[PDB]
Design a protein that fits this description.
It is globular and about 40 Å long. Helices cover 47% and strands 16% of the residues. Strands 2-1-3-4 form a four-stranded mixed beta sheet. By secondary structure, the chain is α+β, with helices and mostly antiparallel strands. The protein contains six helices and four strands. The chain has a single domain, classed as Glutaredoxin (3-Layer(aba) Sandwich), CATH 3.40.30. Keywords: Disulfide bond, Electron transport, Redox-active center, Transport. Belongs to the glutaredoxin family. CPYC subfamily.
């Protein structure tokens, strides 16, 4: 797959608005998903452990964005990073913006 993988990855992120690459069993990914939901957001999630490819993706996402952990939050305009970040963008009443611009 490889570049075939990197495509699907990108394909996914496009539409969106929000996209969280994720695993089923990831504590943090769930904090994210909630944050959105309790924000009035709307997203699309992709549990990579579920899918047969998802591991290649993860490799793709790594090359592409340098983030090997999950989740991988995208808000329309590309890469936000992790939960680890997404929250901090909510500290300052901004994450509500980017989400709005993308649609809530």
């Amino acid at each position: 797959s490889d570049p075939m993988a990197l495509a699907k990855a990108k394909e996914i992120v496009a539409s969106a608005p929000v996209v969280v690459f994720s695993k089923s069993y990831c504590p943090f990914c769930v904090q994210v998903k909630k944050l959105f939901t309790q924000l009035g957001a709307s997203f699309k999630a992709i549990e990579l452990d579920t899918e047969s490819d998802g591991t290649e993706i993860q490799s793709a996402l790594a090359e592409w964005t340098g983030q090997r952990t999950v989740p991988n939050v995208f808000i329309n305009g590309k890469h936000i990073g992790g939960c680890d970040d997404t929250i901090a963008l909510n500290k300052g009443g901004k994450l509500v913006a980017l989400l709005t611009e993308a649609g809530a």
